[PDB]
Amino acid sequence: MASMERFLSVYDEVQAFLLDQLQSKYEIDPNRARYLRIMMDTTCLGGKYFRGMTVVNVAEGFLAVTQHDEATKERILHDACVGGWMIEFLQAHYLVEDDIMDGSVMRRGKPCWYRFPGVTTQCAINDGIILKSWTQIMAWHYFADRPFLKDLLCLFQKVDYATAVGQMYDVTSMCDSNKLDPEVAQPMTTDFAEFTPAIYKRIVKYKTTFYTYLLPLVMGLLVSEAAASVEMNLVERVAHLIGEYFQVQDDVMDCFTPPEQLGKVGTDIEDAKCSWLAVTFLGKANAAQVAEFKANYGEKDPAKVAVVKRLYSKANLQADFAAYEAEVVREVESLIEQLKVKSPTFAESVAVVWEKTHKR
Amino acid sequence: MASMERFLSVYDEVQAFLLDQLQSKYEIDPNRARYLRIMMDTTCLGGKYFRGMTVVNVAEGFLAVTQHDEATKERILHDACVGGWMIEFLQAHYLVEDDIMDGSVMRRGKPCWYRFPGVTTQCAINDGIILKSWTQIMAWHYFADRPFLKDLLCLFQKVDYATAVGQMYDVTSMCDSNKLDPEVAQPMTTDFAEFTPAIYKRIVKYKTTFYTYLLPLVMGLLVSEAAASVEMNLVERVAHLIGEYFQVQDDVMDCFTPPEQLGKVGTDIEDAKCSWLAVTFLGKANAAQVAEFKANYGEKDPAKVAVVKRLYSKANLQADFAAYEAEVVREVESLIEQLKVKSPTFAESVAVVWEKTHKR
Numbered sequence: 001m002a003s004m005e006r007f008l009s010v011y012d013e014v015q016a017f018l019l020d021q022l023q024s025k026y027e028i029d030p031n032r033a034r035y036l037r038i039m040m041d042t043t044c045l046g047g048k049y050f051r052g053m054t055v056v057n058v059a060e061g062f063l064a065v066t067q068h069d070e071a072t073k074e075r076i077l078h079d080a081c082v083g084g085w086m087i088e089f090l091q092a093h094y095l096v097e098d099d100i101m102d103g104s105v106m107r108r109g110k111p112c113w114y115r116f117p118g119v120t121t122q123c124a125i126n127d128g129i130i131l132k133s134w135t136q137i138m139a140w141h142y143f144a145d146r147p148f149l150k151d152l153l154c155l156f157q158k159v160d161y162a163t164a165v166g167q168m169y170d171v172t173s174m175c176d177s178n179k180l181d182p183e184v185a186q187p188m189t190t191d192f193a194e195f196t197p198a199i200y201k202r203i204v205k206y207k208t209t210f211y212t213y214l215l216p217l218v219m220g221l222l223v224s225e226a227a228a229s230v231e232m233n234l235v236e237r238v239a240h241l242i243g244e245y246f247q248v249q250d251d252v253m254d255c256f257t258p259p260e261q262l263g264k265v266g267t268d269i270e271d272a273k274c275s276w277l278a279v280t281f282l283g284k285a286n287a288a289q290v291a292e293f294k295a296n297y298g299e300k301d302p303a304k305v306a307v308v309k310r311l312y313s314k315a316n317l318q319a320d321f322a323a324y325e326a327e328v329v330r331e332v333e334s335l336i337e338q339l340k341v342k343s344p345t346f347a348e349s350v351a352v353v354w355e356k357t358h359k360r
Numbered sequence: 361m362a363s364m365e366r367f368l369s370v371y372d373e374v375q376a377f378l379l380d381q382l383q384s385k386y387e388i389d390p391n392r393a394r395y396l397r398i399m400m401d402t403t404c405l406g407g408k409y410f411r412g413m414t415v416v417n418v419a420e421g422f423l424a425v426t427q428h429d430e431a432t433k434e435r436i437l438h439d440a441c442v443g444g445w446m447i448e449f450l451q452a453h454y455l456v457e458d459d460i461m462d463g464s465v466m467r468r469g470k471p472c473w474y475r476f477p478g479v480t481t482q483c484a485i486n487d488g489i490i491l492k493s494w495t496q497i498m499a500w501h502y503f504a505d506r507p508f509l510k511d512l513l514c515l516f517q518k519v520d521y522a523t524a525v526g527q528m529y530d531v532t533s534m535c536d537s538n539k540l541d542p543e544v545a546q547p548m549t550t551d552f553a554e555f556t557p558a559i560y561k562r563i564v565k566y567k568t569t570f571y572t573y574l575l576p577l578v579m580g581l582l583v584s585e586a587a588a589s590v591e592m593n594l595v596e597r598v599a600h601l602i603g604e605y606f607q608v609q610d611d612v613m614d615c616f617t618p619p620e621q622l623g624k625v626g627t628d629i630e631d632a633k634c635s636w637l638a639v640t641f642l643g644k645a646n647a648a649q650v651a652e653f654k655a656n657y658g659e660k661d662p663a664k665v666a667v668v669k670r671l672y673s674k675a676n677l678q679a680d681f682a683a684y685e686a687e688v689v690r691e692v693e694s695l696i697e698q699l700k701v702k703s704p705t706f707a708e709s710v711a712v713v714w715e716k717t718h719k720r
């Protein structure tokens with residue numbers, strides 16, 4: 001049984017469990033069960049399962065060096081898969097809700113869930129709430145007596161909140177902070193003074209790094225009963241660094257990666273997002289260039305979007321990405337070395353995570 | 361210190377804790393902290409705090425008959441207040457999201473949160489997610505070492521999921537079940553065959569009774585270390601009965617209670633909700649009356665809404681409400697008697713809950 005295959009098998013299992021429980025304990029009818037089945041498949045499946053599979057890969061590393069009965073090996077792999085699916089479902093939650101929040105059209109080359117004709121926003125908001133509720137239902141059922149349940153729930157909790165706070169930082173990233181006020185409609189920044197590397201780092205640390213890198217790595221440690229193999233401050237530092245780099249790539253692709261390849265039309269420019277491109281541009285531009293960015297950013301007009309893309313093309317941002325990238329490579333390698341003192345095995349799993357991020 | 365005063369004092373405390381943590385652990389800036397402060401006050405305050413205060417009232421009943429050091433008494437009351445606020449915040453979550461889902465205009469005589477000029481739907485969806493995340497942050501902080509934490513989290517979890525499932529049942533209550541299909545836009549029922557007392561009971565049991573009555577009563581038991589004072593099947597049965605009755609009242613008020621008194625313009629008729637009125641009407645109407653309901657239900661046109669209200673006025677639904685009410689009174693009194701075998705104290709708290717529901 002290949003690791004991916006085992007992971008996929010567990011989704012089927014978890015899905016059956018969740019739908020069967022709805023029938024036996026929540027009085028659900030078959031048509032609503034089918035609806036939620038489709039909802040779960042449409043929102044949870046179709047990606048690469050990087051986050052889930054990181055939990056499984058960390059657990060598999062420890063299994064290769066730790067002595068266990070066969071049935072214990074299976075139970076740990078099972079737990080890693082269930083934990084992996086908790087992460088995927090927590091992502092599915094955030095994607096459904098964020099697509100609604102942003103008025104997104106496509107995700108992964110298909111319509112966003114809320115756009116399905118028999119869904120609508122009125123249902124999709126609640127479908128997203130269900131998705132995250134499922135994470136907990138999975139955890140309490142599969143992990144009821146596990147010694148790691150407390151620690152797993154507490155971490156999951158913190159990560160979820162970090163992610164929501166990060167969404168708050170992302171959706172407000174084009175406003176001026178001193179003007180935020182629920183009573184007053186928010187103008188887009190005129191000065192772009194909050195488009196800095198530090199502010200960008202804050203948005204990305206909370207919105208993605210905690211759920212994409214920190215939670216899968218630490219969940220793999222927890223299901224393996226291995227959190228003492230590591231210095232946790234190091235695991236945090238390495239997650240935050242790899243995660244930021246992953247977002248920088250995503251920001252580049254939003255602007256430069258053909259829509260068919262991207263699975264959507266990127267709209268970061270129209271949306272005035274605080275992207276690595278905009279930050280990096282503003283960090284090297286002259287006065288005329290800053291002024292021209294300011295005249296054209298955060299507008300749906302295609303001519304204005306195409307002015308911004310041209311400023312980006314001309315400012316030679318490729319050079320800055322290479323330097324950014326070379327620095328993350330230094331730093332990631334450093335942290336991997338430090339991780340090796342206490343756990344070669346875990347260090348190597350971090351190496352794989354990094355390689356999968358760096359080459360894609 | 362009156363119980364309400366103590367409850368309110370704890371909101372201030374919890375609020376300060378949450379905002380301070382955002383500053384020391386989540387890198388928040390003051391303007392965003394102010395935004396979330398206002399958000400928390402606007403979405404969490406202004407109601408009667410029935411649900412929160414039930415936790416405090418149950419705990420106070422047990423305190424009057426149980427021996428404890430003074431500092432233990434304070435700690436239990438504190439815990440009950442924190443637990444009460446977890447419920448209020450979980451409600452705040454559902455109200456913010458449901459107002460967005462339904463396109464609601466007003467709540468408690470003020471605009472729904474998403475309608476605030478500096479909020480918008482893009483922020484309010486995420487603000488609602490934060491609200492529920494706060495419930496967990498409160499629980500892990502205040503209850504970290506409590507022997508009841510596991511049981512409290514597991515219950516909270518189940519209730520939250522029940523509530524979401526109940527929202528799914530509510531928002532789909534005007535569709536025909538055999539036509540639910542994410543691919544196909546959903547027509548409103550033509551036959552109203554799913555407007556039955558049993559189907560109505562299912563919607564209400566999950567959408568409101570679990571979070572409004574079951575969770576406050578059981579949380580009061582948990583913070584008191586008293587879950588062995590009770591037969592839990594009885595607590596469930598009494599919660600589900602009082603809760604259904606509370607919703608029947610709310611359904612009546614949606615239609616008949618002046619908007620200034622209601623805090624909003626009820627739109628259950630326009631929305632084709634499966635309300636007690638519609639069910640009860642259909643359960644006694646003749647063929648001509650059914651046909652006239654069918655021609656006029658679930659339409660925004662005020663003349664059609666006023667036809668439905670007149671059918672309701674003429675069908676003498678007051679008589680049916682009195683009979684419904686007299687039956688709940690029999691049944692609630694019965695359950696209260698049964699609760700007295702194991703706990704007079706808890707029975708009496710249930711009596712107060714019922715009296716507060718029945719007279720309002």
Ligand SMILES: O=C(NNc1ccccc1F)c1ccno1
Binds near residue numbers: 005009010011012045
């Ligand atoms: O292919 C899938 N399910 N089929 C399947 C998976 C595992 C084990 C046995 C199977 F029949 C799949 C992809 C995503 N989720 O499930």
Ligand SMILES: O=C(NNc1ccccc1F)c1ccno1
Binds near residue numbers: 277279
């Ligand atoms: O990447 C560069 N700048 N922009 C940036 C840095 C850190 C985080 C976010 C950022 F946008 C760079 C390479 C060489 N000089 O600047």
Ligand SMILES: O=C(NNc1ccccc1F)c1ccno1
Binds near residue numbers: 371372
């Ligand atoms: O009046 C409120 N806060 N003032 C307050 C409350 C308790 C203790 C001392 C106080 F100064 C209130 C209502 C809703 N939330 O807080």
Ligand SMILES: O=C(NNc1ccccc1F)c1ccno1
Binds near residue numbers: 561640
């Ligand atoms: O209340 C009555 N019917 N309607 C109903 C009953 C239980 C739950 C939901 C309902 F709408 C009633 C009183 C006397 N005859 O019918």
Ligand SMILES: [Zn+2]
Binds near residue numbers: 098
């Ligand atoms: Zn977004």
Ligand SMILES: [Zn+2]
Binds near residue numbers: 251
């Ligand atoms: Zn992006």
Ligand SMILES: [Zn+2]
Binds near residue numbers: 458459461462530
């Ligand atoms: Zn609603």
Ligand SMILES: [Zn+2]
Binds near residue numbers: 610611614
């Ligand atoms: Zn209502």
